[PDB]
Each structure stands twice: as C-alpha cells, then as structure tokens.
Amino acid sequence: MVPISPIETVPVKLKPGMDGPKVKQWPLTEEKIKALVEICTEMEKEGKISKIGPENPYNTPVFAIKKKDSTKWRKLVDFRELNKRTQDFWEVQLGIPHPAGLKKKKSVTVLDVGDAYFSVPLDEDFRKYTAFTIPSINNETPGIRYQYNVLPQGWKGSPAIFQSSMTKILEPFAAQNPDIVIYQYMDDLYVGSDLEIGQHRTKIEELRQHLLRWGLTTPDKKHQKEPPFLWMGYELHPDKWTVQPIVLPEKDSWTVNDIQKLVGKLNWASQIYPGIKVRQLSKLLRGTKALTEVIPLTEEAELELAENREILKEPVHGVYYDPSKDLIAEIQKQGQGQWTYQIYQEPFKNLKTGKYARMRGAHTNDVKQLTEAVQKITTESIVIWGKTPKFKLPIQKETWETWWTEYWQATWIPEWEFVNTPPLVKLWYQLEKEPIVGAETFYVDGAANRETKLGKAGYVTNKGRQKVVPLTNTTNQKTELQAIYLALQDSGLEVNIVTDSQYALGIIQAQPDKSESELVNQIIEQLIKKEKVYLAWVPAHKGIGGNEQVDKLVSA
C-alpha cells in the first residue's frame, strides 16, 4: 500500500431555516430494482456510498433509465429538491476563456479526470441529506437505504467543490512548472506547453504522478481525438481558431423560431465573420410574443441576409494572441445604428471580430454611438487580453476635438488614430456660441389646445417678417418644434432664433444627427444647410417682446 493524501473536505450547509429533503420514492419495476441494487452494491464496494440505519428521516428519489436499443441500466438520482435547499456556492465556471485570448502551444495534451471525481469526499455532516431508498421487490421488505460519501452527480455543489479541490491539488505543480499551462473544463484537463513533444510527455507523466499522491487516475492509452478540438461551439487548431461551421438555411417561410436560431447563429458567427448584421432580423421580434407566428420578410432584411451569406460564403479563422505584439481595434459604421469591429495584431489576421448596436432612444448621433462602441470593445478587451487596444477610428482628429470640447457631458476615448475608410463619422452641425451680427432675428412660439389638439406655430422677426400656421392633431411640444422648423425654413444662411421652449433646447443641446421624431429630423436637415445658427432661450410669459407678441399670435 502506498499511502495517499486525503482530499480536504469542504464544509457544506443547508440554507438558513431550511431542513433536508423528504421526498417519496417512486414505485419501480422489478427489473429496475435489480439493476439499482447491482449498481449500488458495486458503488458501495468502491466506497462511493454507504448503507444507513432507519433513523435518517431524509429521502431523495432514485430512477433507472434505459439507454437505447439494449439491455443495460444507468442510475439517476433526482436532486432537484435537495438543490433547492442547498446553500449557494462560488461558481468559478462563470466565464469560459475566449479562444482569441488563448496562446499558441507547440504541444497540448488532454487528460480525463472522470475517475478522479469520485475520490472527492463529501462533508460528513452533510451526507445524511443525500439519503435515498431502493424500493424492495413487491414492497415486502424495507427498502435499502444508502447515503453518499462523495460528491453526487447532479447535486448543486458537486462542480464547484470538484473544481476547487482539483485546483488546490494542481497549484504546487503549476507553480513549480511555470513553463506549462493548465486549464480545467468539466471532466477534462488541458495541459499545453512550448516544450518539444519529448519533454512535454515527460511533464505529463510527472503530472500523472503528482495526481497519484491523492490517488488520482488519468487514462494511459491516448484518447483518440486530434486537432481540431470541438469545444464550446468552437473549432480549435494549433495555429488558428474559428466557430463551429455556420450554415444558413434556405426557407420559403420564416417564423419567429426560424429567425431566433438565425439571430443566434449570426450573433455567434459575428465574433469571427466580419460585417454580420442582425438589426432587421431582430426587428421582426418587436413587441411580438407569439412563437409559432410566421412573419413576412421585408426586402430590407433580405438584402441584409444576402449580405450575410456572401460574408459566410467561405470559412474565416482567427489567430491566437501574441503578447509581444500590440493589440489593434478598428471600427466601421454600417448604417442604421449598426457598428462592426475587428481586433488584430498583424494586418489581415484577426484575433476576433464583433458588432455593436445603437441603444434604444428618441434621438442619437454617430459620435455618441462610436464612443459607446469603443467603451464596449475596451471592456471586452480587458476581459480577454487584460489590456486596452489601440483604436483605429473613422473620425477626424479635429472632429473629435470639436465634439468633446463643446459637448456638455464629460467624454473620453483612449489612444486612437484616424483611419480613412468611408463612411466617416462627422459633426453635421454646430450652433454658434454668440448671437450673429447682421443675421435676421426670429422670435418663435407654438401652442396647442389640450382638448381639441388644435394649435399654432410661427414667428415674428426684427425685419417685420411674420408667419403663423394652423395645426391639427398636435401638442405644445410639437408646436414648439414646428415654430423653430419654420424659422429655419424661412431664414437665410445665417439666423438667430429665440424660443421659450425648454423642451426644444434640451433636444438640440443633445446634438442629435438623427431622430425617431420626423419633426426633429426635418429640423436637423435644415440645420445642416445653414452657415450659422444661434439659438437663444428666454423664459415664457415674462413679457419678453416679440416673444410675447408671437405667444399671443399662436394662442388665439
């Protein structure tokens, strides 16, 4: 006998105020019972479980399931109730690595830890909660009672305890072999290195030896699998990676189910295939909860789909990460609030790609969206590479300077350079800081009747120019924008506009280049045509002349 180190036990508790499960055992067929007894008998021999006395009040149901075309049986314990009553654990398994952050390795070995799993003991005081009962043949004897001595499969705490135990075992080995890397995923260990295959196989053997001190077994005869690896929806090769193949179906009709597999496939593929667009396909889910419904496909989405398949025409691969080289990120504007990006080290070799979509809102502009996309990419890059990439952005340095100096909000983007690939992000208009000498002055106002929705908008000017227009189906806010629209419509290239509308000014000070409001969009189109616009605000009903006059004119 070679003495083996015990694995340190994790203390486990039930949730506060909760007791263990008591759940009726389902009646089983005679053939099933025989199977479970056989299984539990060997499991008992192996030390995995133990028979218990009558005093344990707790019970969890056990099932036996039939693997198809066949005579052989598998044991299944339903832990759903015990899990509800089990305390929360730290789940280390939250984030998976992204291939783009992984490194090239000359050699990679995969070890199977399945047998090592059951050498992980369960907390002594918690075992009583795992009690389960094998029904007797014809219910003529007391059923056989077992409890678990080890982490049961399907229990809430098994994965976190298992991985944390394995990690603690691996720590000294990894620390004293910095020239190799080890990652644990489910039942597997991935051990890579840059050592030549001879020295590598040695270190693996040393690793097998190390796990043996806790009595742990890794399979000798090599698993028959070789690169590519299929892992978490990816394809992994020694020098490159990509997503598992994406095939976009041909269909005469598309339902909400059809498109959701499609958005998933597309979103998933978007991390590698450059220039994927989901907006229009996503657009068909707006406020619609019926799952079986077949929605007619707009032509605008057809073009989008056809654009996708053309991008999907052939396989595309990402490379792995080289720490010695810089990280670059480049962004392109696709239109309709869509943004796409590539992250790379060397030209025409991407680590990964992705897209960004405009947040929902009444008004927006390209500079804000570009800024948002940069923050997102910044965060994603910290996660994956632990650093911020240098940015290549389709916006002129002067544009950015003009934007952030005059913008009311604090804003920032990290180190970046201009790349000239149209379309370029630009400022469409900028308002004047001071009133304009020689420009005509337009005092505008609008008003509406809350009951009749009848209203008026117009202006009076210093040159005696005047207009008032009657409106139907409108509001105070709408009339206030229309007034401003009219003044823009009727003035020269340079104009001073006076309004009492806090609503309008709030919109314009946000500098939207595009809006959900048709009226705001028309105002923007007018602003763009102007050489100079100065917009002044005054408080209403203060007897401000020409504001007072036009207020009276529009309130009649």
Ligand X SMILES: CN(CC(=O)N1CCCc2ccccc21)Cc1nc(=O)c2ccccc2[nH]1
Residue 370 beta carbon to other proteins: minimum distance, rounded to whole angstroms:
12
Longest dimension (CA), the chain: 109
CA separation, residue 57 to residues 85, 129, 151, 154 (Å): 15, 9, 20, 21
Calculate helix-pair angle for 158-175, 197-212, nearest 10 degrees. 120
**Residues 524 to 543 in contact with other proteins, rule: CB under 8 A:** 534, 536-539, 542-543
298 binds ligand X (CB under 6 A): no
Stretch that binds ligand X, among 31-39, 53-61, 228-236, 272-280 (CB under 6 A): 228-236
Which of residues 35, 43, 169, 236 is near ligand X by CB under 6 A? Answer: 236
236 binds, among other proteins, ligand X, none (CB under 5 to 8 A by kind): ligand X
Two tokens at 478? 């709408």
Residue 480 annotated as part of some ligand binding site: yes
**Interface segment toward ligand X; rule CB under 6 A; list 12-20, 262-270, 373-381, 533-541:** 533-541
Q: Find which of ligand X, other proteins, none residue 142 binds, CB within 5 to 8 Å per kind.
A: none
Sites for ligand X among residues 179-198 (CB under 6 A): 181-183, 185, 190, 192
In this complex, which beta carbon is closest to ligand X, that of residue 25 or of residue 399?
399
DSSP states of 353-398: EEEEEPPP-SEE-HHHHHHHHHHHHHHHHHHHHSSPPEEEESB-HH
* 445 known ligand binder: yes
Smallest separation, CB 515 to ligand X (Å): 14
Least separation, in Å, of the C-beta of 103 and ligand X?
A: 4
| Contact residues for 143 (Cβ-Cβ < 8 A; gap 6+) | 25, 133, 134, 135, 136
Query: Distance between CA atoms of 389 and 381, rounded to whole angstroms?
Result: 7
Residue 462 interacting entry, from ligand X, other proteins, none, C-beta within 5 to 8 Å by type:
other proteins
Cβ atoms of 174 and 211 closer than 8 Å: no
Q: Which of residues 165-184 bind other proteins (CB under 8 A)?
A: 167, 181, 183
Out of 138, 249, 412, 472, point to the residue binding other proteins (CB under 8 A): 412
From the list other proteins, ligand X, none, which binds 161 (C-beta under 5 to 8 Å, kind-based)? other proteins
Choices 52-60, 159-167, 196-204, 420-428; region in contact with other proteins by CB under 8 A: 159-167
- Range 59-88, binding ligand X (CB under 6 A): none
> Six-digit token pair at 79?
């832990």
| 55 scored as a contact of other proteins (CB under 8 A) | no
Other CB atoms closer than 10 Å to residue 398's CB: what's the count? 10
Q: Left if phi > 0, otherwise alpha if psi is -120 to 50, otherwise beta: which for 393?
A: beta
155: number of CA atoms within 13 Å, CB side? 26
Give the pair of three-digit tokens for residue 9. Answer: 């036990």
The answer to whether 409 contacts other proteins (rule: CB under 8 A) is yes
Q: Which stretch binds other proteins (CB under 8 A): 66-74, 155-163, 229-237, 344-352?
A: 155-163
Rank residues 7 and 33 by Cβ distance to other proteins and give the closer one: 7
Token output for 132: 């389960």
CB of 157 to ligand X, least distance (A): 24
CB 316 within 8 A of CB 242: yes
Q: Kind and range of the H or E element at 221?
A: none
For other proteins, give the closer residue by CB, 353 or 441.
441
Q: Comparing C-alpha atoms, which of 489, 484, 488, 494 is closest to residue 445? A: 484
Residue pointed to by tokens 């019926």: 290
- In which residue are the tokens 């050498």 written? 119
Cβ proximity to other proteins, 413 vs 419, nearer residue? 413
- Locate 316 and state its tokens: 């595309």
**Contact status: 419 vs ligand X (CB under 6 A):** no
Spatial distance between the Cα atoms of 212 and 202, rounded to a whole number of angstroms: 15
Which residues on adjacent β-strands are paired with residue 110?
A: 190
Measured from the Cβ of residue 39, the count of other Cβ atoms closer than 10 Å reads 17
Closest separation between CB of residue 473 and other proteins, Å? 27
Q: Which of 5/405 has CB closer to other proteins?
A: 405
d(CA 430, CA 448): 30
Q: Which does 351 bind (CB under 5 to 8 A by kind): other proteins, ligand X, none?
A: none
Structure tokens, 540: 């209403």
Annotated binding-site members for Mg(2+): 112, 187-188, 445, 480, 500, 551
Q: Which residues bind ligand X (CB under 6 A)?
A: 97, 102-103, 105, 108, 181-183, 185, 190, 192, 229, 231, 236, 238, 406, 430-431, 433, 508-509, 511, 535-537
